Design a protein around this ligand. Sequence first.
Ligand SMILES: [Ca+2]
Ligand SMILES: [Ca+2]
Length: 227
Amino acid sequence: SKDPTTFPLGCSPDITTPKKGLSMELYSYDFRKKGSYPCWDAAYLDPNYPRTGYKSHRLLAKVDGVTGNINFYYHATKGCTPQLGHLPASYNYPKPLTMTNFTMLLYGYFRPKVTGFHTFTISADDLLFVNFGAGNAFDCCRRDSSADHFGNYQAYAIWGSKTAKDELTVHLDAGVYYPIRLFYNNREYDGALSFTFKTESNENTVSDFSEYFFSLDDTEEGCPGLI
Ligand SMILES: [Ca+2]
Ligand SMILES: [Ca+2]
C-alpha cells in the first residue's frame, strides 16, 4: 500500500552485501528572471514538484554512498543571488554547487538496531519531504519500477510555514531494511537540513547514520520483508 502508516513494511535482502549509504541526485533550481517580485521561484511548492516537476530542471550529479551525519547549515551573504558552497563530506560530493538554490533527492534503506518505536525529527530551509516504508517510499528491491509512485508524505517541513519542523513516529524491527525517500529544496539564501531520531528505549539523539543507511540492489524477484 502507498499510504503512510505507524507500522511500515520493510524488506529482507538476500546474501548480496548491502552497500553503505543512500544514493543522491542533485538538480538545478533557478531564480526567476531579474527584477521578479519576489526573486525566488515558487515552483518548489507545486503539488507535483517532488514527483515529476523537479525532473524538468538540470541534472547536476548522481552520487552513491551518502552516510554519516547528513545535517547541514549553509550561510549565504546575499538574497536573490546564486552563491557557491559545498555539502558536508558525508554527501560524497567534492564539487561546489549553488547552495543558495538547488534540489536534492536521496533514497535507500533505513536498518534499525532496536525493535520498537522510533521518532524521527526533521526540519529544513526550505523544504524536506519524507516517505518511509515499502510502498510509501518504494517497493523492496524494486525501486526502479516504483520510484515515481511514492504515497502521501510521512512527514514534511517547509521553512516560514506553520509546519517548519515535523516528527514521524514509526514502530520498526531491528535488522529489517525500510525504504526511505528524502526530497529537499533550497529556494534562495540560507539552506539547512536536519534529520535525526530517538528510540522509545532511551534519551540518545542519533544523527550519525553510518550504522543505519544502506543501499540494496534491485532484483527481478524483489526482496519483500519476510518478518
Ligand atoms: Ca542477490
Ligand atoms: Ca532558503
